[PDB]
Structures are given as structure tokens and as C-alpha cells.
Amino acid sequence: GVGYSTGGWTGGTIFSENIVVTKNTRQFICDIKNGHLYKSEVLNTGDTAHRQYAITTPWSYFNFNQYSSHFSPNDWQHLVNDYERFRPKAMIVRVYNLQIKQIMTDGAMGTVYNNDLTAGMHIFCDGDHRYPYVQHPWDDQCMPELPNSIWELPQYAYIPAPISVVDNNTTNTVEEHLLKGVPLYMLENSDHEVLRTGESTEFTFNFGDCEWIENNITFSMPQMMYNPLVRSRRIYSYSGPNNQTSNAFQNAALRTSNWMSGPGIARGTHNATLQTQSAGALVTMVTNGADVSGVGAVRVGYSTDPIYGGQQPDSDLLRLRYSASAAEGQQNPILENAARHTFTREARTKLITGSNGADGNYKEWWMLPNQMWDSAPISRYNPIWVKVPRVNRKTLLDTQDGSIPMSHPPGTIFIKLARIPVPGNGDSFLNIYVTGQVSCEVVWEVEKRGTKNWRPEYMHSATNMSVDAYTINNAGVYAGAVQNADVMQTRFNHHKVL
Amino acid sequence: GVGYSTGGWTGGTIFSENIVVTKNTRQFICDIKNGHLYKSEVLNTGDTAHRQYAITTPWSYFNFNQYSSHFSPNDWQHLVNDYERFRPKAMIVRVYNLQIKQIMTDGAMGTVYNNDLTAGMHIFCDGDHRYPYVQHPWDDQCMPELPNSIWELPQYAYIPAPISVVDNNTTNTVEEHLLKGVPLYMLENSDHEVLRTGESTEFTFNFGDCEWIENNITFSMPQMMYNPLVRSRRIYSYSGPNNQTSNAFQNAALRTSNWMSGPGIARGTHNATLQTQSAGALVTMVTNGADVSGVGAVRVGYSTDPIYGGQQPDSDLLRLRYSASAAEGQQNPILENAARHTFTREARTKLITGSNGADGNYKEWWMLPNQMWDSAPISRYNPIWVKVPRVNRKTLLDTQDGSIPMSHPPGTIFIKLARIPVPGNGDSFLNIYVTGQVSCEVVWEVEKRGTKNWRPEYMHSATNMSVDAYTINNAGVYAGAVQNADVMQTRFNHHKVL
Amino acid sequence: GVGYSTGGWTGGTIFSENIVVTKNTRQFICDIKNGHLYKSEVLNTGDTAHRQYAITTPWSYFNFNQYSSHFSPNDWQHLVNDYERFRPKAMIVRVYNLQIKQIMTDGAMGTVYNNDLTAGMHIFCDGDHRYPYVQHPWDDQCMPELPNSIWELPQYAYIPAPISVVDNNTTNTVEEHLLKGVPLYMLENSDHEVLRTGESTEFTFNFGDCEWIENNITFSMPQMMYNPLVRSRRIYSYSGPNNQTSNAFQNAALRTSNWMSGPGIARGTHNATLQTQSAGALVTMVTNGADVSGVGAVRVGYSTDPIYGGQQPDSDLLRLRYSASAAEGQQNPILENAARHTFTREARTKLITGSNGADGNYKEWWMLPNQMWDSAPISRYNPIWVKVPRVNRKTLLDTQDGSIPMSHPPGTIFIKLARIPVPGNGDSFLNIYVTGQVSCEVVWEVEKRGTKNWRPEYMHSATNMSVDAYTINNAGVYAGAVQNADVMQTRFNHHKVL
Amino acid sequence: TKNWRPEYMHSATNMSVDAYTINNAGVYAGAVQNADVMQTRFNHHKVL
């Protein structure tokens, strides 16, 4: 059976008037995660750390949730420059050209690796989301930006419950009853495939009428939609001098609209020790009884950042910054938000208070009727989608991320080698690993749109990008975006009218 | 031929109004049992031990006779909570993804293992029961409760005759003539399969109109079926004061029925050294002549426990206790019987004797006409079936086990590696072993039933189960039921009327 | 709608070669039982009494479980004298000619009764046995033996649980957990009819292949089936004089058979205070934990009498005696068993012990293979059927009663007046009652059989019955059977061969 | 669900001894304590 290609190499991008197709293939690798066995572990223990409860599985998985993985920097450039809106339509993934080898470290020039035909590889796709979802936005280890760069699949693990609630089952009846109910998930529970070297498999996903990524900017606020030469009939009242009421007409080019800017909380900051404890501007803890005595919740609750939304944050360092990341050893931070070209995004509401004109700022602009704003921008390095949680109560939902929210996001494709046991049982097994190829073709629905704007428009040039931007250096090491110019932007480019 | 999946991984459970389907797959392993040769051995020699005569075979075998192996604890919960009766309908077993490797221990980093394509594996299914049956209730080594846990197949061996009868063939004409007739069974005697790595095989079994497992309890004894407000016409005689006979009518809410409780022997105890000698409340030895001088039969006969049946045992430690077991190194005992919710199960009959009311207890309630009772309970950890022996005389037959009795129980699937001999004959052979996957899909006929009972009913909650119950701990070690709460129960749940 | 017969009066009996049909109609009456409400009560409190836990319902019910109710004494005579076997085949019941009147006691010549057209009567038939069954053998208040005698329907009530187990819920965790689970049944739970005066309803039941009532006797024991002139070849061993073994042939007319007599316990007696506490030869208590400290079980368990079965009871007053009963104020006891004409019924087994001939009696003849005997007799006053409890374990089952056992016995027909509330609510209601007619036609499958016996046979004559037997006396008061002659018998009449 | 562990279930083993009953006067008692009422959001584990 072996000895046959069982696939090829797919790459490139094709642009059409209404569609774009990205084809990427990567060589992947997979170790024997864990002991071949599920483990209950406590991670992030630093004495003053957060310390979450987790289940670690013998499975590893593919994650495609990152634009950079599908578009070459050049492609992404034409995408953002030429199209006004776009969204993912369909994805087809293939796993093939599998090779499973066992590692024998003799001692003498050991680690010689030999093929093991007849050694199987499990591969399962959750599809319906029956197991805890992990494709969290911004996660590291996604399909590598550069083709020809190995993809080391990340091991699968999830958080069954907030560590704190069960912190003391012995010695607390509540934190104990809760602990009694903690769930447990294992994949062997469902049907899935097992492939020998001569085999392959394919998976296809269809984004529904998912949200569209709008790539446009205004220079005009919703409350600026009027004719400066025509006077409004409004006639407002105000406390005149001394004690009386007088009324007046704002002359033309001054008017009051029905629209307010986007909601959000512009204040707050980040924990200094965040790298070990919740760092979110928000923290949002829950304990149904429980204990959780004497800690900064910053060691109990879970962070959610950013928060400003349609408001201009009162201080920097609130800003959503990111790096291609994440391995220790030097990478450069960059912010998509750094360019600010649209005038529905960085709002600063104030109440009027006194008749002189003295204002009062709103560092917390809660939701109210008639608020209009544009979504946060994204860039080649942003994350494509976010699973919406299975809750029966949802609010307006704009992602601060810029990521496409969806109840049924691409399923997770898991894999793990067979647990080839061995005789002379001490509980051990054969040490093997897998390598193969993964191809992910994505069909993107694109839409081009024209304006009657006479003047030119901002365009990602690469004349304004770093000299490092997107390159290889004498060791075969690749450099992605090095500065905010490079990332490209959404809400950078096209002037709309409103 | 090799290099093809020749199977996949099947798992999960599906519930329907009248059916439930359990699908489990496990990775298995198999050594070269014995010398590759049959041996006549004497086991359990402890000087004061029982010491049985046995034939050990080069074969190993699969055993599926345990509920825990088919239902996940959660599944079993819904099964017992929601359905009133159920029974196995059909089983389909598959053996595939075979890999046969030979072990060379060089010395230098030895035990390197190499595949041996073209190395066959024998697999035979008795089906008709032509070879001594061994799927004895409660046996250890059955399909592992947790998927993803290796199944080490147990070697096959049986007891040709009670050791004692032949104990002295030389020096006793009877124990000798008997010995002359002892039989001998070997599997090479029948046709069976031989599979190379690229192959697989399947077996299907059909439980006939086998008995049903009833999951219900009463709170009402068969002799309590009457109206407390209506008087019975019976008019009994009794020895009145001094010397005369007078007669009377028990007023209403008092009555005498035709029904008696279930038979059984409530007395007796367990041998203290049982772990080496019959420990059964009963012992039941047979010797057609023979010798068998000067031993507690407890070293001759074979035990049969429990014995109380439809009676309440007069002392604890009669109770049928069990553990998932059985390897030495700490597991916890648990009893299914521990919950006692039905009022047909723990009976205590007494005869009246004297007219004052003085009773006489029956520690031995033998079989009599009109006895009504419910079968013993079972739990996820109980054994599914028991082969009924081929005898032409059978009694009423309720298993104290709770196991389903059947003349034609699932056949035994045996396997052993080919005896690859080697040149330079010193009688040796190539050291190889097998590993593969086994899938066992069972179709369970289920029946739901409703009551007119107004009040709520007992339900296995997991609010009442240990905090350990069913979990994994920092080493990838699994914990099943830790206390009697956890096992679930039969005769725990549903109120019937009678 | 009212003013129409909505029925007639059906009576008489018709005999055919293979069928007999009994038609009876009775005028019935029904009060408003309880407060119109269900009550949890403790009955039979006498300080030293049994004291059962019970639920009393606002419903009343019809019971037809008594031969005397269907056959006129004369009819029953021809039935037993002429037919050898018989059994109930089908029953059709009708409720009609309903009249509902309200009772106003003015004071002045009060209790004037006025019709209430538009006042409904609930009538429900359990049919499937969803509510606790109460047609217990020998119950008083069944369809009256004499037509033209009013039937006062007995109120419905049942025993949810043995009082003792819950005796102390406060102060005993076990007797408390049990109490938590006690069930509760109410009829409003199911659909049923509501009839105004102008209406009627009908119900039909079909006895399946229920057991047959055999009316025959032998004068020959199963171990007497041989030729006194032919010698048996058997040749038995016995301890001869001094110390040796000799063997011999029983000459002809002496033989040993394979048959033994019927099982049963011939000893024991009846409690002297039975009229308040279990009086059964047996008592059979069950307590799953519980308390039940310091009482003769005779105040805890439930009696089951008689017990001798196929054995001759060692003392009188064991004998199943009865009266048409049961209201206090003088009725005469009678026993069906008093005539003893068959020689399979009153057995007295003895073991031989010593070679001289010295026997040992078996006052407890438990069940054993090869036991042959005839069922207990019955009479016009015996009870027709007994519901077999819903248990999954049953023994041989001959009723000491003589009653036909059946899993699906005639359903119970319940009735209660509508709860006509009244304004000015103090929680009261209109006082009304119902009277109507009930007709019960039963089809009896009969079978006549002839013998080659030359001599005449015993026949219920009425030449051998009391002068009172079956009569009316100057007050319009009826007398049924006054002595054992009168009751007629089963196992009295026909000689069979075996 | 694919949850392996058991799940909370309204048992009536955890409900009052009064729960849902009739007492010597024909008076009915419904739920007497929070156990008895049953619950929604008590029972089934979902994934999100």
C-alpha cells in the first residue's frame, strides 16, 4: 500500500471579482503527548500566580484561526487595498503523506529513526463541538505564516472548572459539592479515524452567513450629517443671565443629531504582574458560594481586555497590542489600532452640566439607544473567528478583537499516535511520532466597491513599511511584520459616505 | 498489503426510546503464553491451600462480560435512571489493525522492537462452546472500563477435573481409574483463522429471548396487597385460655395471604483463610469413591456464595461484596446490595409455635410453593451473563449474581501468535507479540415505563457520590467507583405496584 | 334526558354442555367517603395491636371475587355435581339506572331526600392495575349473595408501606430515608368517566388461559399405582442381624415409587391475640435496616396462613376456616377442607431411620423433585381469583386458597360522587349520595367428564345439609350455609384414575 | 453529552420527608424546602 504520493503540494492565491482562494500546505510533526494518558494538572503555579485546574490530553490539534497563515504578505496587501469587504466562505482541509517512525536511542549514534508501516494515527474532527473548544483568538502555534516552516502541533488541554471554586473540597461543603460535579471529557468517547501511511483524509467546513469584515473609514461622524448652510429649526432653552429662561437657534453648520458614539469603558489599567495573574482591564469572577479568601481577584477571576470599544481609551497601554509571538527569545509588539483614520472609532463623550459650557467626561459610556460606530480594525496578524459560547442570553456582541463571531466555528481537528504497547509490561510503550502534510484551502467571499471621492486614498504601500518587513536573513530565519506599518490595516483604507 | 487502516475507532453510546447502543474500542496486547505449548499444572499450592489440577494453554482470550466495559459512568447513569427494564440484544466484535513485532534484546539498548510482516496471528471463536467455558462471573481482565487503557489479554486455562479425585492414582484403584478417563482439550483441534497485519475479522452474537434486568422497587410486600378498611372473612382457630378452642376474625388491615418470601439460607459464614481455600458459605464437594482423607473439605470441595437469596442474611460478611479489582496494590470494596429499597428482598420468616406469639426463626428457608420475590440487584460493575451448565436437571435458577443466565452465552474469542520456530533447533522459537484494536458494539433492548406515583423517586444523583468518583489524578491513573453510592444500583430506582 | 330506563334487571343461570352463564344484578349505594379527600391514617391501634400505615381515598369500589355472588346455591349444586372442571372465561359488568340525591336534614322530619339531576358520579376502572390492587381473597362486602339485597360499596384504601419501617423517621436515619421515598397514589391522576342520571357504562374482562378448577378425588395415592399380584424386581439392602448386609425382594402388593406427596409445613399455631396482631402460622417480616425494637414480630411482619399444603396439619386450628361474615353480630364458621375424600391431600411423610422400622416424622416437608398432589378444595363461599404480585421470581404457586392466581385479574371498578362544593366557603360541600344497579354476567367454561367407575359417587344432596341451609326467616333475613355440609365442596365429588 | 462523569439529578433522597404529601386531615403539602422545588440550571452540563 505504501509508496504512493497520497497527495501533493498546494499553494498560492487566486483573485477574482467576487472571490479569493487561498491554498496553503505545511509539513507537520506530532509527539506522543503526555504519558499517552489524560492527566489532571494544576498549571501556572507561582505562589502569587493564578494557578488553573486543567485536564491535559494525549491529543494534539490543528488551528487555522489566523489570517497570516492564509495570505502571503503580498496577497494580503492586494486584498486590503483593492477590496472593501470580505469574509470566509468555505474551508477544505486535507491530512496526508503520513509517515510514522519510531525512535530508538541506542546510545551509539542513537536516535536513528526507522519507519513503522502498520503504525496508525488517530484523527478526529469534533465538528459539532462536543468537546471543549480551544481555538481561542490570538493563540500561538497556528498554521505557520511561512510555508516550508514546520508545524509543531500543540497538545490539547482544557479547563474543566475555575480552580478556585474547588480549592478546598475538604474543609468546605460548597467547594466540595461543586467538585463532585466537575465534568470530564475524553475523545476516545466518539468515533474517529485511524490511518496507516498509505492513507489520507479530508474535512470540509462552511462558514454560514457569517459577519463581514468591513474595510472602510469616514472622516465624518454620524452627528455631522448636515448642510452647514441651512439652519435647523430646533430652538433650544438655556439658563440665561441672572434668573430667567431664554431660547435660541444654533445658526447653520451647528446642529444636534440623534446619534451618539459607540459604548465602552475608557478607564482602568493592566495588572503589573499580569504575566502570572489576570491582567485584564476587567476581571469578572464567579463563585457559587465557594471560598476564595484573601486574594486579589486578579488571582481568582478571568480577564477580558480591551474594553474601550467605541470610545477613546483615556490612557495608552489599554490598547490591544500583539506579537506574532510567542516563544521566549525576542519578537516585536505591534498594534493594529495604531493607525486611527475613521471617525466613528475614537470617541470622547462629555455631558454639559453648567450653562457656561463646563463639561463632564464619561469614562464609562454604557449602552444606550441610538449609538453608532464601526467595528475595531484587524490585520494580517489578527485572528479570524471566535466561538460564541452556548448561552441563551447575548448582548450586542461586537468583538474588540475584530474576529468573526460564530456559533458554529470551524471544528477542531485532533490527532494522536496509536498507543503501541509493549510486552514485558512495566506499562511502557513504543516511542513513535508522526509527520505528514496538511493543506488548507479557504474560499473567501470578496466584494469590491467604488466611490465618487475625487481625491486619492490611503494605501498600504511598503514604501512606508520597515526595511526588515517580511524577510529572510542569513540564517534561514524569517521576519514577519516588524512595525505597525507592516501589519496592514482594516479601517485604514476606503472612504465611505454614511 | 500492509499500510491500510483496516479499521477505525468506534465509541460512544446512543439512546432511543426502545434501544441503546454501546460502542467501545480498546487497544490490546498479547504475549506468547506458556512455552507455546500446553502444560499440566497444579496451581494454588500453599501446603494448606486448595491446589487445583489445570491445563494451561498457549492461547489468550477476550472477555466482555462486564457492564462497566460498555457504558461510561454517565451513560450508565441515564440508563438506570430513565429505563425500567433492559437486556442485551446483539453484539458485534471486530479485531483489526493488527501489528506483530518481534523482540530482540541485544544487550546494548535491547528490546528494540521490529515489525514482522508475514507473521500470523491465530484467532478462533468457540461459538458453540466445544471447549471449556471460562467467562466466569466477576473475572478480572475484561475489556477495560476506560477506553484508551490497554487490554492485556488473559491466558487461557481450565480445570479438567477436581484435583482431589486423582490425588493418588498410584496407591488407590478408584482415584486411578478416574484419572484414566480425565479428558484433554486443545484448540488446534478445530478450524480457525490466521491473519497477517493487513487483515481483520469480525464476529457477531445474538442474545436470544434472554432474561430481562428489572430495575424496580416496591415498599410493599406480596402479603400486603389488601384494603385496611375491609375485613377478611377468614375466622381462625387458636388455643384459648385453659383448655378449649375459641375462634376469631382479624379486624381489617390485618390479613393472611398465600404468598411467602423468597427462599435462601441466611446463616453460615466465610472461611478465615479463604484467600487460599474455598471461602464459600457453601462447599458442595463430590468424589466418586476417591480418597480425600483428612482435610477440611474447604480444601476439597468448591464454594458457592452468596446463599441468602430472598432472605435477609443473619450476619454481615455474607453480603456479596466486590471490587473492580483485582491486581495486588490497593482497590476499594463495594457492595451493590448495600442499598436496600425493595420490600421483596430482605425477608425474615418466622414460624409461630406457641399461642402467646413466641416465634421461631428460619435461618434456612427452603423452596416451597407460592414464594414471591425480586432478583438480586446489579450495578455498572456487575457481570452481564453466566453460562448455564449442560445438565439435564435444573432448579428455579435465580442468580444471586444478578447476571443473565443463558445456555448459549457469547462465545469466547481466542488468540495466540503463530509458533514461528527457528533453525539451530534447541526447540526454541522467535519471540514476537501482538497488538491491535478490538471493537465491541452491543445493542441493548431497553424499555421505559411510567407510573401513577405522585411523589418523586430515588435517583442516582452524583450529588451523593464520592468526590473521587470516576476520575483521573495527576499521574494518568483512573479511579472508578470508590464507594457504594457510585456503583449505581438496580432495585434502587422505580416504584412498581404488584 | 332523565326518565329513561337506561337498563333492566338481569338474573339467572344457564347450563350448556361446555359453558355456564351467570347473570346477577344488585342495587347498590354509595356515601361520600372521607372528607371528599385523601387521608393518611394509622389503623388498628390497640397499644399492643399491629397498627398499619394507610392512605384512605374518597373512592369506593365493586368486588366480584366470590363464587357465592354468581351462583344460586341450587345452581352451584348442579355445577359441582355434574361438571368435573370449570373456570371463569369472561365477565361483563354494567353500571346504570343511576340516581343521585342530596340529603337535607332540616331538623323537622329531616333527611327528606331530593333528586339532584345534573349531579355527576365518577366511575373509573383500573384495568391495567396502575393503582394498588385490593380485591384480596376472602374480603367482605363483595357483591351480595342474595339478589334483592343492597350492596354497600366499601371505601378504597391501601397500605403504602409497612408502618414499622418509618416508625421513627425523626431519630433514625434509615427509617427516615425510607420514609422519604414512600409513594402516593390518587385516582384523579388518570382519565375516567363522569355520568349524570340519564347515563350508563359497561366494562368487559377476559380471563386468559387461567387455571382450571379441578373437582375430583382419588382413593389412590401416586405411590399405589401397581399390580398387587406382580412382584417388583427391586431387591433392597438392609442391615441384617448382628453385623452384615443382607438383601431382599418385597413380595408383590408392596413396592416403592418415584412419587412423594405434596410439600408443606404441618406444624405451628395461631397467635392468641390474633384479632389484633398477625395471626398467621407464618409471619415473614422485612425491614431494610429500620428499627422495629422490642415487639413480637407478630406486631411487625405480615401473616400468611395456612401452610400445610399437601401435608396433613399436625393439629386442628391450622385449618382454613371461614365465614360469609364479617360484620359483628353473629355468623357461623365453616371449613371447606372438612370433608377429606381425596388421597393426594392429607399426607404424613416419615423417614425410616433405624432398620427395626422406627420412623421420623417430617413436620416440615420442603419442596423436592417428584412431588405429586392435588390443589386445595373450594366451595361456593371461596374466593375466585388472586392477583399474582409483580415480582420477577416465582415458585410453584399452588394457592392454599383454591383461588385462581392470575397476573391480570379483573380490574377494579371505582366510583365516588362529584365533590359539589358550596359557596360561603368554609371548605364544605353538598351532601349527596348515589344508588344504582350493577349487573355482572360471567361466562364460565365448563367441562363434563365420564368414568368407567361402576359404583355410585358422593353427591352434594341437601339431604345431608342443615335445615336452615339457604333460607329466609320471619324477618326478611337470609341464612346462607350454616354448616360444612352446605358449602358444597371441590375434591368432594368425582373419582379419577391417575 | 460526551461528559464521562455522572450529573446532578433531583433525587427525592435529598428532599424533605414532608415533600409532596397528605397528612391526617386531608391537607396537602407541596414543596417544603428548596431541595423539593426541583430546578432549572440544576442539571445538565453543556460545553459552550
Give chain B positions within 8 Å (CB) of C399.
258, 370
- Tell me the residues of chain D between 1 and 40 that have a Cβ less than 8 Å away from chain A: 1-5, 7-8
Exposed / middle / buried, residue A279 (Cβ in 10 Å: 0-12, 13-18, 19+): middle
DSSP state of A180: H
CA distance B486 to B465: 5
Give the burial class of A400: count Cβ atoms within 10 A of its Cβ; 0-12 exposed, 13-18 middle, 19 or more buried: middle
Please tell me the experimental approach by which this structure was elucidated. X-ray
Strand partners, B60: B155, B415
Q: State yes or no: cis peptide before C326, omega within 30 of 0.
A: yes
Q: How far apart are CA B310 and CA B398, in angstroms?
A: 10
Residues of A in contact with B11 (CB under 8 A): 188-192
> Which of A1, A177, A422 is nearest residue B1 as measured by Cβ atoms?
A1
Contacts of D2 in chain A (CB under 8 A): 130-131, 185-186, 189-190
Which helix (DSSP H) or strand (DSSP E) does residue A203 occupy?
A: strand A201-206
Whether the ω angle into residue B241 lies within 30 degrees of 0, i.e. cis, is: no
Q: Which of chain C's residues have a Cβ under 8 Å away from the Cβ of D13?
A: 177, 180-181
Q: ω into residue A132 within 30 of 0, thus cis?
A: no
With CA atoms as reference, report the closest residue to A254 among A216, A226, A279.
A226
Residue with cell 474560499: A443
In sequence order, the 6+-apart residues with CB closer than 8 A to the CB of A232 are A226, A249, A250, A252, A254, A255, A256
The 10 Å Cβ neighbour count of residue A350 is 10
Minimal CA separation from B53 to chain A, in Å: 27
Q: Hey, which bits of chain D come out as E strands?
A: 21-23, 27-29
Asked if residue A140 lies in contact with residue A326, where contact means CB atoms within 8 angstroms, the answer is: yes
Break chain D down into helix, strand, coil percent, rounded to 5: 0, 15, 85
**CB-CB contact of C122 with C153 (8 Å):** no
Q: What is the DSSP letter of A146?
A: S
The answer to whether B6 contacts A196, with C-beta atoms less than 8 Å apart, is yes
Q: Based on C-alpha coordinates, what's the Rg of chain B?
A: 27
What is the per-residue DSSP string for C443-486?
EEEEE-------S------SSSS-SSTTEEETTBEEE---STTT
Instruction: Give one word for B177, left, alpha or beta, with left for phi > 0 and alpha for psi -120 to 50.
Output: alpha
Whether residues D20 and C184 touch (CB distance < 8 A) is answered with yes
Cell triple for residue C57?
381515598
Cell digits for C429?
360541600
Question: Do B486 and B492 contact (CB within 8 A), yes or no?
Answer: no
How many Cβ atoms from other residues are within 10 Å of residue B292's Cβ? 19
CB-based contact C211:C87 (threshold 8 Å): yes
CB-CB under 8 Å, B221 with C396:
no
Give yes or no for a cis peptide into C423 (omega within 30° of 0).
no
CA-CA distance, C258 to C368, in Å (whole number)?
Answer: 12
- How many beta-carbon pairs below 8 A join chains B and C? 337
Nearest Cα of chain C lies from the Cα of D40 at a distance, in angstroms, of 22
User: Which residues on neighbouring strands pair with residue C64, listed in sequence order?
Assistant: none
Domains of chain C: 1-498 (2.170.30.10)
- Chain B meets chain C (3+ C-beta pairs below 8 A): yes
- The beta-carbon neighbor of D48 closest among A182, A185, A390 is A390
CB < 8 Å from B in window 164-223 of A:
169, 176-177, 179-181, 184, 186, 188-199
CB contact under 8 A, B228 and C301: no
Chain B residues 124-163 within an 8 A CB cutoff of chain A:
147-148, 150, 152
In angstroms, the CA C159 to CA B322 distance is 36
How many CA within 13 A on the CB side of residue A236? 11
Residue of B nearest to C154 (CA): B230
Check residue A242 and give left, alpha or beta (phi > 0: left; psi -120 to 50: alpha): left
Interface of B with C in 349-408 (CB under 8 A): 349-359, 366-375, 393, 396, 398
Q: Which long-range contacts (CB under 8 A, 24 or more apart) does A16-20 make?
A: A16/A446, A17/A446, A17/A448, A18/A445, A18/A446, A18/A447, A18/A448, A19/A89, A19/A443, A19/A444, A19/A445, A19/A446, A20/A79, A20/A83, A20/A86, A20/A443, A20/A444, A20/A446
Q: H helices within B244-389, ranges in order?
A: none
Residue D39 distance to chain A (closest CA, Å): 15
What's the burial of C275, exposed, middle or buried (CB within 10 Å: 0-12/13-18/19+)? middle
DSSP A371: B
**C-alpha to C-alpha distance for C403 and C383, rounded to whole angstroms:** 6
Task: Give the Cα separation of C279 and B169 in Å (integer).
Answer: 60
Give chain D positions within 8 Å (CB) of A391.
48
Length, in residues, of chain A: 498
Interface test with D, best of B72, B145, B453, B473 (most D CBs within 10 A): B72
> Which residues on neighbouring strands pair with residue C390, listed in sequence order?
none
Chain mean position to CA A249: 49
Find all residues with CB under 8 Å of C191, minimum gap 6, and list them: none
Which residues have CB under 8 Å from B108's CB, separation 6+?
Answer: A106, A107, A108
Q: Evaluate whether A181 touches B462 at the Cβ level (below 8 Å).
A: yes
Number of C-alpha atoms within 13 angstroms, CB side, residue C168? Answer: 8
Residue of B nearest to C164 (CA): B219
Phi, psi of B164 (to 5 degrees): -60, -40
Strand boundaries in B384-428, DSSP class E: 385-387, 404-406, 413-417
Q: Tell if the CB–CB gap between D15 and C177 is shorter than 8 Å.
A: no
CB A319 within 8 A of CB A340: no
Select from B16, B215, B466, B388 the least CA-distant residue to A170: B466
Contacts of D8 in chain B (CB under 8 A): 461-463
Taken in order C186, C190, C192, C194, is the CA torsion positive or negative? positive
Omega before A157 cis (within 30°)? Answer: no
CA distance B254 to chain C (A): 7
Record: contact A131-D46, CB cut-off 8 A = no
**Nearest partner of B74 among B468, B464, B461, judged by Cα:** B461
Structural Rg of chain D based on CA atoms: 15
Under 8 Å between Cβ of A134 and A123: no
Q: Which residues contact B10 (CB under 8 A, 6 or more apart)?
A: A191, B23, B24, B25, B439, B441
- Write out the three cell numbers for B295: 482435610
**8 Å CB contact of C157 and B223:** no
Query: Is C45 in the D-facing interface, judged by CB distances under 8 Å?
Result: no
- Using CB atoms, list chains with 3+ pairs below 8 Å to chain A: B, D
Contact: D6, B459; criterion CB under 8 Å: no
Q: Contact A416/B148 with Cβ under 8 angstroms?
A: no
Which chain B residues are within 8 Å of A55, Cβ to Cβ? 472
Amino acid at A299: R
The distance of B119 to chain A (nearest Cα, Å) reads: 13
Interchain proximity D12–C36, CB inside 8 Å = no
Sign of CA dihedral C472, C478, C484, C489: positive
Option in C39, C179, C180 nearest D26 (CB): C39
Size of interface C-D (CB pairs under 8 A): 33
Residue A274, C-beta contacts closer than 8 angstroms, at least 6 positions apart: A303
Please give the resolution of this entry in Å, rounded to 1 decimal. 3.2
Q: Measured between alpha carbons, how far is B185 from C179 in angstroms, rounded to an integer?
A: 57
Q: Can you tell me the distance from the alpha carbon of A468 to that of A73, in angstroms, rounded to the nearest whole number?
A: 13
Judged by DSSP in three states, D9 sits in coil
3-state secondary structure of C411: coil
Question: What is the torsion angle, in degrees rounded to the nearest 10, for the CA atoms of residue B316, residue B321, residue B325 and residue B328?
Answer: 20
CB atoms within 10 A of CB A390: 11
Q: Which three cell numbers stand for residue C224?
A: 399405589
Q: Which of B2, B433, B463 faces A117 most closely, judged by CB atoms?
A: B2
* Whether C395 and B349 lie within 8 Å, measured CB to CB: no
B221 is written with which cell numbers? 410486600
**Distance from C-alpha of C471 to C-alpha of B151, rounded to nearest angstrom:** 83
B partners (3+ CB pairs within 8 A) are A, C, D
Phi/psi at B70 (5° precision):
-100, -35
CB neighbours of C170 closer than 8 A, spacing ≥ 6? C176
A and C adjacent (3 or more CB pairs under 8 angstroms): no
> Residue C130: CB partners within 8 Å, gap ≥ 6?
B451, B452, B497, C190
Pairing of strands C393-394, A432-447: unpaired
Sign of CA pseudo-dihedral A479, A483, A484, A485: negative
| A131–D8 CB contact, under 8 Å | no
Note if the bond before D6 is cis, omega within 30 degrees.
Answer: no
Structural contact between residues A271 and A376, judged by C-beta atoms closer than 8 angstroms: no
